[PDB]
Design a binder for this molecule. Structure first.
Ligand SMILES: O=S(=O)(O)O[C@@H]1[C@H](O[C@H]2O[C@@H]3CO[C@H]([C@H]2O)[C@H]3O[C@@H]2O[C@H](CO)[C@H](O)[C@H](O[C@H]3O[C@@H]4CO[C@@H]([C@H]4O)[C@H]3O)[C@H]2O)[C@@H](O)[C@H](O)O[C@@H]1CO
Ligand SMILES: [Br-]
Ligand SMILES: [Br-]
Ligand SMILES: [Br-]
Ligand SMILES: [Ca+2]
Ligand SMILES: [Cl-]
Ligand SMILES: [Cl-]
Ligand SMILES: [Cl-]
Ligand SMILES: [Cl-]
Ligand SMILES: [Cl-]
Ligand SMILES: [Cl-]
Ligand SMILES: [Cl-]
Ligand SMILES: [Cl-]
Length: 465
């Protein structure tokens, strides 16, 4: 039929300069590069939050996490009891469910991080099939983590880390035997073949945990980078390379089943690279978690041979929030009544090279221990507050590294963008959970969120003398 298949390939903590098509000089990603070159590379792509849980929530709900109560990560080994509601609210309908109701065969593979209790399970949230783990990460070698899991059960460990838990397949044990990146690639191939056999459009949410810690890589991938002297960089490159291998096999499967031409492949990272653990975000400033560009500006391409031209670069800013309305539009799917969305259906803009966010803002706000980091972009201009320092105004097109603070030269533009961003925060909800005890103390006493203090300007720079 006319409706395209959709494959999201979502990496975890992949740095900005860590794929070939986005600038890498040491990591080799020929299969991803080939896809990017045969479609549209997005040079100003943003995720809705600079860390996983809230970013993933935003991709699947189509709303900023500040509107859904999900702006902090779930903790390690979060409650698996429905009564504790440790998960994204069930009332916020996921794009997977919408696609499933419109006749797609739907599959999620890899990392979830959206709730470990039954009501939050992928199979309850629109996925016909799920293969992966429910929490925030996982050790990569089954021979290693299955030994550790059994050994800790035998020792009577009452709090085994979910990183070594057996993975699952629709709620049954997975009995994985491969390096799990290779396993996730295998399950993607299989689900592509199932969709081909059913003669049904597919939506596959392939959430590799690579290159997220722990840095663990196959010897055969390491040898591709054996000369790289920094052991972290060497292992990380091999981890990314393994994803690239899997994408190459997925691509051959799509061609063999004749689904390649009419499949939209979207590749991105859930957030910026963590430069403490192998990642490189050049030329951006900062690291995973920041509201510098480095925390939430990510590599992205769209690949869809039927519609998207080759060698395209799309330079206008876009959001991972656009995936929900764009995909449901492509699926000719009807949104549930009352569903709220923060992004736009951008596919016509990509095809015509027009500006979807013209005179509109793409935002980040990240909660810290007593203050807020903020970023906000319109057109060529961005405002940033990091570490509760004085506000910065950057021409992000001219100054991608956020080095030249123009707040003094153009104070009206600064204040203009502040006012719009402060108005945005008036729609926020309270978090359903926070992350640390410190967090809970600050919110309970009203020290957080204090958006009013976040949007102070002149008193941060004026001298009292
Ligand atoms: O690894 S060891 O040093 O041996 O200790 C481990 C374990 O420590 C790890 O926990 C996580 C897995 O690797 C890193 C180690 O510190 C951690 O990475 C974290 O993964 C999370 C997802 O599972 C998140 O990505 C997390 O990042 C977040 O951190 C906070 C919360 O939200 C923001 C930020 O505010 C986000 O960036 C990331 O750091 C240790 O916990 C355990 O005690 O011992 C193990 C060894 O047995
Ligand atoms: Br749902
Ligand atoms: Br397993
Ligand atoms: Br860290
Ligand atoms: Ca991440
Ligand atoms: Cl453990
Ligand atoms: Cl084809
Ligand atoms: Cl740091
Ligand atoms: Cl064409
Ligand atoms: Cl700085
Ligand atoms: Cl001005
Ligand atoms: Cl709270
Ligand atoms: Cl002020």
């Amino acid at each position: 039929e006319t409706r395209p298949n959709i494959l999201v390939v979502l990496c975890d903590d992949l740095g900005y300069a860590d794929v070939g098509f986005n600038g890498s000089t040491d990591i080799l990603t020929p299969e991803l590069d080939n896809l990017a070159q045969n479609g549209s590379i997005f040079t100003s792509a943003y995720v809705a939050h600079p860390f996983s849980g809230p970013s993933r929530s935003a991709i699947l709900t189509g709303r900023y996490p500040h509107l859904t109560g999900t702006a902090y990560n779930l903790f390690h080994n979060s409650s698996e009891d429905d009564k504790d509601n440790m998960g994204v609210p069930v009332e916020e309908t996921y794009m997977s469910k919408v696609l499933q109701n419109a006749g797609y065969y739907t599959s999620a593979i890899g990392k979830w991080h959206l709730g470990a209790a039954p009501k939050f399970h992928p199979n309850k949230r629109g996925f016909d099939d799920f293969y992966g783990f429910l929490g925030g990460g996982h050790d990569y070698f089954p021979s290693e983590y299955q030994k550790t899991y059994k050994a800790q059960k035998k020792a009577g460990n009452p709090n085994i880390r979910d990183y070594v838990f057996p993975m699952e397949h629709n709620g049954k044990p997975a009995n994985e035997t491969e390096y799990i990146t290779d396993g996730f690639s295998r399950e993607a191939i299989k689900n592509i073949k199932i969709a081909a056999a059913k003669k049904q459009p597919f939506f596959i949410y392939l959430a590799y945990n690579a290159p997220h810690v722990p840095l663990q890589a196959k010897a055969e991938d390491v040898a591709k980078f054996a000369h790289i002297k920094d052991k972290d960089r060497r292992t990380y490159a091999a981890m990314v390379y393994a994803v690239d291998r899997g994408v190459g096999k997925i691509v051959q499967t799509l061609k063999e089943t004749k689904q390649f031409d009419n499949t939209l492949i979207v590749f991105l990272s859930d957030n910026g690279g963590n430069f403490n653990h192998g990642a490189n975000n050049y030329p951006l400033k900062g690291t995973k978690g920041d509201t510098w560009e480095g925390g939430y500006r990510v590599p992205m391409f769209f690949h869809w041979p039927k519609k998207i031209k080759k060698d395209q670069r799309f330079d206008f800013p876009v959001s991972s929030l656009d995936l929900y309305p764009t995909f449901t539009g492509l699926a000719e799917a009807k949104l549930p009544k009352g569903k709220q969305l923060d992004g736009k259906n951008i596919m016509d803009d990509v095809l015509k090279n027009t500006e979807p966010y013209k005179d509109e803002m793409i935002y980040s706000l990240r909660y810290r221990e007593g203050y807020n980091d903020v970023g906000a972009r319109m057109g060529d201009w961005k405002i940033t507050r990091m570490g509760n320092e004085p506000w910065r105004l950057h021409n992000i097109t001219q100054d991608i590294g956020e080095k030249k603070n123009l707040a003094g030269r153009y104070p009206d533009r600064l204040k203009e963008m502040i006012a719009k961003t402060q108005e945005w925060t008036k729609s926020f909800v309270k978090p359903l959970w926070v992350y640390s005890v410190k967090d809970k103390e600050l919110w309970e006493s009203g020290q957080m969120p204090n958006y009013e203090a976040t949007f102070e300007v002149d008193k941060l720079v004026d001298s009292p003398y």
